[PDB]
């Protein structure tokens, strides 16, 4: 897919906190 | 006596070297960053000037080409005036630090960063934003906190980019130059291919939490090798002045920012002025100070309009805080040109020319990692008589040329490559009209004379040049920004772009508190102005010329 | 809405757009004729700078290369500094305007004419003057009275040809501006080959004949879309001031402008003018500030000076009316270059020195029509020592740049083809004195000099720089003014040619009330001393020399 | 009525000539010497600037192309910005002169020195100086004394040449410049290629014996057509407060120099001026007037500061007269870059870089003679930063070009040739300190970066700059002037040299009196401490590198 298709990166700082928010919850 | 403190910057192991070289300077400081290094020197008066009204910042950043190992190229085989990428970078540097001067602060302050060693693979600038920082840091100067810098980058795989390399940034999505404190973001340059707001958002946060290793070495480095901070007092309020305009005649400010007409409001508000200076001109008791009632005034004119922005209140215009000025577009308004568009967003208005060429009219630039063609440029013209008044009428300045760089940013994605296109192109914007950002309309303007001339461009690109209003934790976001609100907000942004996502975005913030839903909220709404304003362009022309034009090899 | 005005100039359709483009300026018109579309701005500004005692009126015509589809050349492919076409092309249009504005008005004034299309076959100055007239009568800003200016060449089967295009100006014995107003003529710039003053003359009768339909367009747009005038005040004269030194002090003055030596003159004056400013200086504490007593005083001389050069009395240095200065020519001064002459005439000196090179040493002029070989170059230096004073050496300004224009106008007729003569050929006159005019004697010089250098010039060309005061139904014509006398004619006419025709007629007219018995009896007086001035150089050098110098290249 | 003077100057014939051209400037003579003819000009404002506190003097300097027969290369085919040999040949005729105009004579001067013919043989600089010496004796303005000026080359077997031609310098081992008056010796610029003291002395001394034929003939010239001289009266010295304030605090501004501490030093002189401004001056009557006071106290540090240096006291800074500062060497401090040094000396750092590139690298001189391919260079830069200071930063001024070709003389000696070396070299010296003789540091820096980067130069050259206080008939010579003590000299010389011998030397004497045994003494403590510079410099490196930079091509 082109870039704009593609979502949050795995680097963005709101993902790590939403998946240590889901690995602490 | 030299200082050496090492850091990582992502992967990159930085070197912040103070104590040996210019030790004459108020702070200097030798940075050298993945092979690239820089020597970046912070002087500052030590006296204010008598009659000094405004503070003297002064950047400069210079790339020596013996730093590349090559004998400067032209007639003289020296370097000469700043080339574009000296002035654009010392403009990048600039427009950090000077919101971060305590106000009332007059003395002369110069930066000159020079880089001195190169390995051609990275560019200079960031080491260059970390030597200010460190040079800020060091010499004392009234400066409020380290500053950090990173550029970032993006890859649909690797995911964002940290401090790209000139070999990772062919292959990216993504140039976006991001500086800012330990707890806000102060300045945002990027430009990209059609990338999300979110998208765009990310980038912002990621390099925010990524140059917080800058700051944590510039303190450290402060706290080892600083110099005593200077003894300089902020002038105190005439809070008791103040506190008298706003009754005295303070009621007739609020009823003279109900006028929508520039001459009426004006004269109005000029008669209060006058009417109160003498009423309490200079502090009461001897009523001796002249201009200090004026502008205890024009401080309560500040937040008065503001205050009303905040509330919710029409603008110095009529307006409400979603509305676009009416637009009037036109194309092919010059009968010989290959390419034209006048472009008029209320009284903002920008004719804008498309010349195309053959190969023998590409820009050499010589560059210090070597030398290229450009097969693109834009040029940017703010003659004075767009304001209604009398100037200069010489060489480009820093403004022309940053505002020019804008409107190349945001329209850069939809150019066509050489493979398909085999000709140059060289858009140039002049600024007939200015009460808003002219940079905005000079990327529809050149979008539109692109698809008039012939040029096979991607999609049209619009821009928009919107504000932020923050009052404690009220806040009001304008769009489509005036002249007159230019200097009256918090945060003043400029988004261009297609309908699929953002080619280019600028941010400057100069206060603390806005957070990421602020930003997102923003940027929705710079989105919506965007597409009514590309929704009206596609009703005059949609896509480009079926045929080259008729004046064009 | 735009109000759009079609009128035909001869043959020509001209439209003036006004109300679309640069509506913040104080008057701004569009102007399309014969394909060539020209934007003319001028801004005023409201009130005038606290101090100032002259008059700011500053003209920038800019000519924009994507107004021929093209894209600039040199290194930067930007538009820079103004070339020499720009600059004559300014100066051209400032000259017939500046005498127009009121006397006493300091407000600053910017004319801005920047040149948008072209097909590339006519000048686009006549429709820039156009322009400036439209936007000047719309602005509102005090001016008297709307200018017409047209380009006039001749054919000896056509007859006189109204804005001849490029080809036409191929094959026409003349290049003429003309500008003026309904009822006067106030600018003459003309290039001939040898024509009689009687073509001359016709010529610019013809040019006045045709203008005013442009003066009528223009009144009619004025009426239809013109700003409210501008609420400005004449200031008034002090009539008793200027009774009491013109009684008092009345026959002081003119018993020292009867001394003839310069320095026991001045230092004569300046004592009258310490009385002056003592007796009168003061009435309340001060009668009014020391530069209204020295204001009143330079009027009285002048008006007195004026009285005397019409009354028939001597001239500041003794001269007749009909006298030219004392001539002292000579050839081969130095001793390597490849032509010298210095010509002497009173207190003006011209050294001027002829070179010649091959087609390598061509200039190659960018031309906004294309790209041109200039094998003539004439460059005219005026250094501050000339006049005895400590200026500034440093790049040619308008004024060199215009009279070395002149100059080369004035002797082109007489250079020989590449044809016959396949050479470069490069002339610069050194003013070494200047107490007059220098253009005319760098015409001589010029002349000389490559007579010298062997260059196979058609004939000898004089120049001779004249004046003409005129003081209600008396007039004046004064020959070989002097520095002195420059501000104190009415008209400056400057007429170079040969023994058979003119090559240059330049004139600056200033007043409504001279006719074409004045001009004609004006051109007449200047024949007689061009002819004067062409016997006493024919005895120094009559023919080129039938051998080049020692180094042909 | 031309006047000419005819006189040998060895065995050359010099004309002057005056009365002919520019006979309104001050003062104008044409120098006709060895077939190269130079107009050279004065000009003198009557009466002094009000609010003028320096005496603004300046001389330009100019080689006219058509002298050489040549039409100018580049776009514009005219000559413009001066040339680096131009510059360097006004800074040489202004050296001379500056200071024999009496102290406190404030009249703006202007020297214009025009070259008008050559026949490419020999350099038009000696005629200028000629000119101007001539031109100063008969404009009239205080000027003591005429001066001479005379070029020196030397060969082992021929011995001393008095004006070598170009052809003569191709195989002279000096180059020597030495400008003086019929008394003393007031200017020497040399480059030898290493020869001793006393054959640099002694060239010294066969100029001054030389160029008194010039002093003669500009004595007659002056005797026979020179205008009355002005009558200017200096200010009579204020012996009242100069003694009232000399006896009050004369131990008081004593200590104050006995402290080393510059900032200590600074406050309590300060607190010295301050205490003396506050009695002696104001607007009661008595009161001295404003800061005449002020300035009688700089003028009472001054002699201070001389009498405690030639009394064998202790320096400002605590050094003896025989020191030299503490030297820091470094080579090879940045990665990428051919060669680069650091070299501090106390206060005075110089980051050299050298860069080497091929044969298309070469610089292009279109000298007067023809065009010259330069395949050395040397930049010299002096930030603002390098003094504490803020200011302008762009094009190099009249100062680094001057100081660029002192250390480009010093150099200049120990370069290979294109058949040892075929590559350009290109060494940029950056002053990132200064508190001293830069120029110096920037021969040491020269040296140690050619080596650093493998260039086979002939040896290690290093500079020391002196000075020399001579109080009647005592006198001091100072080694390692600092930037405070530069001011207080009487003499001001740089020896830059190897350990064999001198290899450039530039004096600029400002008194009269100082003997052939003074400058024996000053020379012979200039090679100590050259001896001493160069044994600290080869504990670092030695010799040229073992092979070409890796880097490097």
């Not at chain 2, 008598?50 to 790339?63: A, I, N, T």
């Not at chain 2, 461009?457 to 619009?462: N, R």
């Amino acid at each position: 897919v082109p870039a704009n298709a593609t979502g949050r990166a795995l680097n963005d700082p709101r993902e790590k906190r939403r998946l240590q928010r889901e690995a602490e919850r | 006596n030299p200082v050496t403190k090492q850091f990582q910057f992502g992967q990159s192991t930085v070197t912040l070297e103070t104590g040996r070289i210019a030790r004459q300077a108020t702070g200097a400081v030798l940075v050298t960053m993945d092979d690239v290094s820089v020597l970046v020197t912070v002087v500052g008066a030590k006296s204010p000037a008598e009659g000094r009204d405004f503070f003297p910042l002064s950047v400069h950043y210079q790339e020596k080409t013996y730093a590349a190992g090559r004998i400067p190229g032209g007639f003289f085989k020296r370097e000469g005036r700043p080339s574009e990428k000296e002035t654009l970078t010392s403009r990048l540097i600039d427009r950090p630090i000077r919101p971060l001067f305590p106000e009332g602060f007059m003395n002369e302050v110069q930066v000159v960063c020079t880089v001195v060693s190169t390995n051609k693979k990275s560019d200079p600038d960031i080491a260059a934003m970390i030597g200010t920082s460190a040079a800020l840091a060091i010499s004392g100067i009234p400066f409020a906190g380290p500053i950090g810098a990173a550029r970032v980058g993006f890859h649909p795989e690797i995911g964002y980019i940290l401090n790209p390399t000139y070999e990772q940034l062919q292959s990216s999505s993504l140039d976006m130059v991001v500086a800012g404190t330990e707890d806000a973001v102060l300045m945002v340059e990027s430009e990209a291919d059609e990338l999300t707001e979110d998208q765009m958002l990310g980038a912002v946060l990621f390099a925010h939490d990524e140059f917080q290793a800058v700051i944590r070495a510039v303190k450290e480095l402060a706290a080892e090798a600083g110099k005593p901070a200077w003894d300089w007092k902020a002038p105190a309020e005439n809070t008791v002045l103040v506190n008298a305009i706003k009754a005295e005649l303070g009621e007739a400010i609020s009823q003279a920012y109900t006028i929508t007409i520039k001459q009426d409001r004006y004269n109005r508000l000029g008669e209060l002025r006058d009417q109160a200076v003498a009423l309490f001109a200079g502090e009461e008791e001897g009523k001796f100070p002249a201009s200090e009632v004026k502008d205890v005034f024009g401080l309560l004119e500040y937040r008065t309009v503001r205050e009303n922005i905040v509330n919710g209140k029409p603008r110095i215009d009529g307006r409400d805080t979603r509305t676009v000025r009416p637009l009037r577009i036109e194309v092919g308004v010059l009968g010989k040109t290959h390419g034209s568009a006048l472009f008029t967003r209320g009284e903002t208005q920008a004719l804008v020319v498309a010349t195309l060429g053959t190969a023998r009219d590409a820009q050499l630039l010589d560059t210090l990692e070597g030398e290229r063609k450009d097969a693109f440029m834009l040029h940017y013209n703010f003659p004075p008589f767009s304001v209604g008044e009398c100037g200069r009428m010489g060489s480009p300045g820093r403004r022309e040329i940053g505002h020019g760089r804008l409107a190349r940013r945001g329209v850069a994605a939809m150019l066509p490559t050489q493979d398909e296109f085999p000709y140059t192109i060289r858009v140039v914007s002049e600024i007939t009209e200015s009460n808003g950002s002219s940079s905005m309309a000079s990327v529809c303007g050149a979008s539109l004379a692109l698809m008039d001339a012939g040029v096979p461009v991607k999609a049209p690109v619009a821009g928009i040049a919107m504000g932020l209003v923050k009052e404690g934790e009220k806040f009001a976001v304008l769009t489509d920004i005036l002249g007159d609100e230019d200097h009256l907000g918090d945060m003043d942004f400029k988004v261009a772009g297609t309908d699929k996502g953002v080619t280019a975005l600028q941010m400057d913030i100069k206060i603390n508190g806005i957070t990421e839903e602020i930003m997102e909220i923003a940027l929705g709404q710079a989105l919506e102005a965007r597409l009514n304003i590309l929704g009206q362009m596609n009703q005059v022309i949609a896509k480009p010329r079926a045929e080259l034009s008729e004046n064009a090899p």
